[PDB]
Amino acid sequence: KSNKFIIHNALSHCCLNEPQKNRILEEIEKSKANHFLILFRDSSCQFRALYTLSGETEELSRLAGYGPRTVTPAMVEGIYKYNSDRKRFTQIPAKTMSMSVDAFTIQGHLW
């Protein structure tokens, strides 16, 4: 599995401002990663950064944008999925990280 197409769709049509957007979309193509996640500042879902998830370490690594280099499960607050037709993200009830997860927030003190 991968969610690269969902993420490209969200970045293109929801989150993002053209020269930055293109820079980020370029980062995604050079990436060999399968699972990408968007970091938001808060529950209003404004883009901060883009991460890739390692299944082996369970850690999120920053690929682009404004955010910490590494995000662990303890640091994650909320998790979200993208809805393409509605052009918005919706909060998922807390659960183990999985491929359905497209975006997240982190604990506030981490900023």
UniProtKB/Swiss-Prot annotation:
Query: What is this protein's tissue specificity according to the annotation?
Result: Expressed at the apical surface of respiratory epithelia, as well as in the acini of submucosal glands (at protein level). In cochlea, restricted to the organ of Corti and increases during development (at protein level). Highly expressed in both sensory hair cells and supporting cells.
The organism's place on the tree of life at top rank:
Eukaryota
Cell compartment(s), UniProt: Cytoplasm, Cytoskeleton; Cell junction, Adherens junction; Cytoplasm; Cytoplasm, Cytoskeleton, Cilium axoneme
UniProt note: phenotype after gene disruption? Mice are viable but show growth defects. Disorganization of epithelial architecture, characterized by impaired apical-to-basal polarity of microtubules in epithelial cells. Defects in the stereotypic positioning of the nucleus and Golgi apparatus. Mice display subfertility in both sexes and severe nasal airway blockage leading to coughing, sneezing, hyposmia and rhinosinusitis. Majority of cilia lack the central microtubule pair in their axoneme and display disorientated basal bodies and defects in ciliary motion, which is no longer synchronized.
Q: Where is the CKK domain?
A: 1-111
What do we know about how this protein assembles, alone or with others?
Interacts with PLEKHA7. Interacts with CAMSAP2. Interacts with KATNA1 and KATNB1; leading to regulate the length of CAMSAP3-decorated microtubule stretches. Interacts with AKAP9; regulating Golgi assembly in epithelial cells. Interacts with MACF1. Interacts with isoform C of CDH23; leading to inhibit CAMSAP3 ability to induce microtubule bundle formation. Interacts with AKNA.
Domain-level remarks: The CKK domain binds microtubules and specifically recognizes the minus-end of microtubules.
Q: Which family does it belong to?
A: Belongs to the CAMSAP1 family.
This molecule's function is given as:
Key microtubule-organizing protein that specifically binds the minus-end of non-centrosomal microtubules and regulates their dynamics and organization. Specifically recognizes growing microtubule minus-ends and autonomously decorates and stabilizes microtubule lattice formed by microtubule minus-end polymerization. Acts on free microtubule minus-ends that are not capped by microtubule-nucleating proteins or other factors and protects microtubule minus-ends from depolymerization. In addition, it also reduces the velocity of microtubule polymerization.
Protein name as annotated: Calmodulin-regulated spectrin-associated protein 3
List the top taxonomic levels of the source: Eukaryota, Metazoa, Chordata, Craniata, Vertebrata
Stretch of the intact protein here: 1122 to 1236 of 1252
